[model samples]
Target: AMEDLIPLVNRLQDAFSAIGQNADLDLPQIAVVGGQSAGKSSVLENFVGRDFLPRIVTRRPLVLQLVNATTEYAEFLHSKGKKFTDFEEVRLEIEAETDRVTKGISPVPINLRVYSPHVLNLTLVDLPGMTHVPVGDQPPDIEFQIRDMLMQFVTKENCLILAVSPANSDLAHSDALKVAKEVDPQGQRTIGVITKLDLMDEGTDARDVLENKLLPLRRGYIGVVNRSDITAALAAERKFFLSHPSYRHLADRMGTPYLQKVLNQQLTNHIRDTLPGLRNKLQSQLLSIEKEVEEYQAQRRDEMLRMYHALKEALSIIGD
Candidate 1:
């Protein structure tokens, strides 16, 4: 009676071991990168829950670093913001004041804190925008510099790189695609986010835009709403929007026609558009890859069985 179940148990153990040995590990480090004026900072602000520089533009691109600070023992370099043990005490800091610095110069790195309830703990890094220069003129070698920086961030295994390109811009630039391919060599974990969809014409389909405009290079792509909408939604969740007791007065104080328009547009786009066709496309690709993997595994199993039978025949002849 025990003998009959032995084979089944052994097979189950072997299968589990094989799966465990071959499992692909993934670390969720999302890098939001794009060209200058591509809303990279806006996305960072939305994700990190603070407004480091809400209005004035920084001509030179700056890298904003975020690290976990959940305990008093935790320590990291201090560039711009004060390091605190509690996540709630963390704040966004501007490296250099725009008024003091001349245009077209890069500032020291900025730092911010992020607190999330999701157990999947994520690390978000904001990279300097491509083609950004501190002075009035464009850099003579912008492409090479941007590529070098991006490559450095993605050299590690299990890196999930997110490249952000505004929907309004041309997505097929050779340099951009080349850098994306280099960073996502196997094309397994990279994701592209086509942002600023609200700025496009109402009838414009983001799926077509991504497929025709961006996916020809076989990059994994997704679309997201503009930053302002995300912030507004978050504020609403906290009951701090407009009529909320804690924020009603503050909202009124900051109320202006321009701010209102930006908020309304961002919110409208988030609700009306964004992320429509991205899911299906990604799902289809994933399913295809899974099928291919299963087929390969079956082939390998048959090959192994053939070798085992050959070994048994050789043993019988030797015994004879």
Candidate 2:
């Protein structure tokens, strides 16, 4: 059987995060970044088989961790251990928790865990959309604030950047791709998503971009059609790609389902590549702690104060 790398990393991330020790772990995860109305929520909703992201602008980042389970449920870190069956309530809780701070933005992120049999085990960081100007009591430099916050996640070595850009817009000046290109110049860890394909101008399509013939990325691009209902959306998207003259040949590469598979494979490979380094870190730390333990026992027989210091150092290593 093929190993499920996503779940393995998910477990480690959960344990480290619970104890606030994930900073040094450098766990692999996907981070979604795009401009407002670039279909970031729609793309994420398609992955979860339900609609839960807010329609209005987001003031903070959302760490969405999806797990495959027999029973479908949602939980937030703020109200931990409580299962939410109603999807609508999940949306409300997101807003409430985000608003829990003040009217302005907060660097603190809200962690939302969704357990569903329909979802592939994945952890995604959804950040605030890239905004150009401030509006409605927003700070004047809100654009920079949003970009700075997004950089904190995208700049991570272990994070894969999913830069979503609408097909109706000009890819030459896409804000999402621009940011990703700046961080990942070689395009090794960036995946481009061309959304709103159905809204493109008449007789115009995203064939070149989807085929990676334009503004190419190492991970390439996937086009998707957004809809409120994922079931209907998937069917419609399949049909759109299959029946359309230009896209018919690329049906295998387009749509939400295909995008999901690509994301799964890409992220699994990413985690596998980093697994060796993670093991090295753990092993070295364990060896140091074992050495300290031996010294602690020797110190106990010779002296008491040095034993306390040795044990404390060992404890710090374990805790760290």
Candidate 3:
């Protein structure tokens, strides 16, 4: 009997270890998520502090094998010294790699490398966008099917889901709301980011629109930043264009026309407009769930305690 319970005891020990470790070390494992063209890649670049184009560029509907590298050298899943190729094969090789890098691995990359700082410690999986209609003629429902598969993937997570919608789009659209609900049922870790603010009319404050309209419909809001600000390459190119001899005349004529403001006005507008609604949403949800969770804990408390004691006794017997 004790022998039979060994695996159970080991699993419990693993769970305890995980809980203890998480409490001890507040490691950062952020998921950079958003709809396609919502600046997911740009946000990821800012987080990782590097120019990782291959991984970002290859983020399309079709599955393609690729390798991601960081400027700062770091170890990842025992495949160190150089970048690992073959993303698909890497998924297949998880079992072998986990034994070599860290023990008690989770099958998904997000879980496997959740503790590594060198690696941004975050698994940035790009899901197909909700409105991503495939190029060329295809089945009518292809987009819906693709979105469903992506939602299934999103359901399993170690980090938050950052949903992005364009400022120009309808904030309360049925499709967007439905997708958000499916992907984030509990609403625990969903953050809404409104993108394409620049596309809004020059004088109009896009931030006001999101705060007044978008936040009520969404759960969490991390505020929004102009997508252009996050693109290092683009920023550098713009700088170069302004500095170049040919363009210097234009720059001088326009009195530093090339200088791209960080869009603080827009970001500030986003926070001022959206935070109140976001807080209200979170507060309301929290109150509702707190009661349910407390009831669940109260109901299961005795049973859980009994199981713990029983497991301890079984382990003691095996040791004897």
- What lDDT tens digits, residue by residue, belong to model 3 across residues 136-169? 4434665565565455445544234446566555
Cα lDDT listed for each candidate: 0.40, 0.77, 0.38
- The residue pairs that clash in candidate 2, if any, are none
What TM-score should be assigned to candidate 2?
Answer: 0.82
Give lDDT for model 3: 0.38
RMSD (Cα, Å) for all candidates, in order, is: 17.8, 6.8, 14.5
**Comparison by TM-score, 2 against 3, better one:** 2
Which lDDT tens digits does candidate 2 get at residues 1-320? Answer: 13477766655655544432333445578888899868888888888888787772677767788888888789887687799999999989988877777455655667788988667767787888888878788888888888887887788788789999999989966778989988999898899999998898999988899899988898989989875556777888898889989888889989887888888888888877876666666567556655755645554444333333433443343342
Q: For candidate 1, which ten residues in a row score worst on lDDT?
A: 19-28
Give the candidate order by descending lDDT.
Answer: 2, 1, 3
Candidate 1: list runs displaced more than 4 Å.
Answer: 1-28, 53-76, 79-112, 116-120, 132-134, 137-143, 174-177, 209-220, 227-320
> Sorted on TM-score, highest at the top, how do the candidates line up?
2, 1, 3
TM-scores for all candidates: the values are 0.45, 0.82, 0.42
| Candidate 1 residue-wise lDDT, 1-320, digit = tens | 22222222222222222222101111123445566666655555554444454341443223333323333211123332344444323322233332234333332223233332210122344555666333445465554555565555555443345566776666664233445667666555455655665465655545554443436433334444442444464444334225434334434322222232332233233212322332233245445544544544677776445433433332332232
Give the number of colliding residue pairs in candidate 1. 3
**Regions more than 4 Å wrong, model 3:** 1-33, 53-125, 136-142, 156-159, 173-177, 183-188, 209-213, 217-219, 226-320
